Design a protein around this ligand. Structure first.
Ligand SMILES: Nc1ncnc2c1ncn2[C@@H]1O[C@H](COP(=O)(O)OP(=O)(O)O)[C@@H](O)[C@H]1O
Ligand SMILES: Nc1ncnc2c1ncn2[C@@H]1O[C@H](COP(=O)(O)OP(=O)(O)O)[C@@H](O)[C@H]1O
Lengths: 235, 235
């Protein structure tokens, strides 16, 4: 009855009035590629660094089952597909979403969306949490707060699914293309602090051909940050 | 993201761009009570009497998984819940639908919807096919043909699910109530013919406490027609 016209993402959609976590349901259940898990609210969601995520009613909480069979070298770039899809949808609604490496989307430096990618073997689950009309944690923001009015949740869903499907199909054939889109929509040229095994600061210059964040420390040293247990803070 | 507020029916919804049959999927898959299976199109759908059911894009093709904890005697009345729910939704859109015993809904004697109820294990699958914006077989009709304009498919879905949830919750407590709703919305007082073995004609007088169609033959004989592989024709 939704009349989706996508090729892979959205072939099937499982909607829940309530769920613990769309990513957990997607990871655990036997689902076909392209199946989307979406819920009005999540009671136990979390972000990329396993830190609690608030998912009250009004937001877009979904996960997508993917089985990308691309070279092991390009597989890690899957993490950016969700962030770019969100940016494109936000632009369609005239909201200036910008990517905070590696998976977050901010608007005026306030988080409006988070991306959580989890993979086990062939199966990759792409989770996205986008604040639309819901209340958000202090410091974060939403589409409603940015536009000054409520936005039809279903319209955002249709827009995002369409963008993601296009991005995904092109990624399977041309895995490098996504990096250019990330580069054009990422927050760069500013000082940042990289938090992992210790910490270091420098200018976030760009992302390389592997999606690594390139940081220039004041000494001139160049470090390349890989996707993982690392947090980025703007100074 | 659909924001359904129903209690049981619609707690979960599985949407398909394309499916063979919503009833078959609901029958062969483990699904919690209230799960709704819906598809843009069915490639192998059929009606109560096993005849192919045209399910092209534009219509509302769904199945609902139910496990009514009511006396065995009442279980057979589920089909009526579907027909009454459709009639209530049609009225909301200013369409006067009437029930053709036991599972069809007609508008000016043209079939606009069919109900197919099947049981597997201890669960019941309530299937409903409602013509909305899709092309229909000769002699049939749709909400679009009746209103002379495109009808928002999702609005019809929301309406129907809301009506069915209400009807079902009451059925669990007062299972006899549905019969009265059926009577008040069924085509009666007209001549009909029961086809097949032992075929006969008479006036469709009413339905009894078991939902059997009461027919008065010209001889004065009274026959009670049971739900099942029964074919009826208006004379
Ligand atoms: N709905 C929400 N919108 C924006 N930010 C949120 C929301 N819910 C939680 N957060 C923030 O996001 C964090 C979860 O994402 P995570 O990637 O693990 O955090 P981090 O920002 O430390 O990388 C929480 O610790 C919280 O500060
Ligand atoms: N989308 C549709 N809308 C209305 N009627 C339909 C549709 N698809 C099929 N039909 C009609 O319904 C019949 C099958 O329904 P079924 O309940 O099994 O038996 P019958 O209606 O003949 O008693 C088909 O033979 C056809 O005439």
């Amino acid at each position: 009855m939704l009349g989706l016209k996508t090729s892979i993402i959205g072939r099937r959609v499982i909607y829940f009035q309530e769920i613990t976590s769309t990513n957990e349901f997607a990871k655990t259940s036997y689902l076909e590629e392209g199946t989307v898990i979406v819920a009005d609210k999540q009671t136990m969601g979390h972000g990329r660094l396993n830190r609690k995520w608030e998912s009250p009613e009004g937001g877009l909480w979904l996960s997508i089952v993917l089985s990308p069979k691309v070279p092991q070298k390009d597989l890690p770039k899957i993490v950016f597909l969700g962030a770019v899809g969100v940016v494109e949808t936000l632009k369609e609604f005239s909201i200036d979403g910008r990517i905070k490496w590696p998976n977050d989307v901010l608007v005026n430096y306030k988080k409006i969306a988070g991306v959580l990618v989890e993979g086990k073997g062939d199966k990759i689950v792409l989770g996205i949490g986008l604040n639309v009309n819901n209340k958000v944690p202090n410091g974060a923001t939403s589409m409603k707060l940015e536009l000054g009015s409520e936005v039809p949740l279903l319209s955002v869903f249709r827009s995002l699914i369409t963008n993601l499907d296009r991005l995904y199909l092109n990624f399977l054939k041309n895995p490098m293309d996504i990096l250019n889109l990330v580069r054009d929509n990422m927050i760069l040229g500013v000082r940042v602090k990289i938090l992992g095994d210790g910490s270091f600061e420098g200018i976030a210059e760009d992302i390389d051909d592997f999606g690594r964040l390139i940081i220039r420390l004041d000494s001139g040293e160049v470090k390349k940050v890989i996707y993982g247990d690392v947090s980025l803070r703007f100074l």
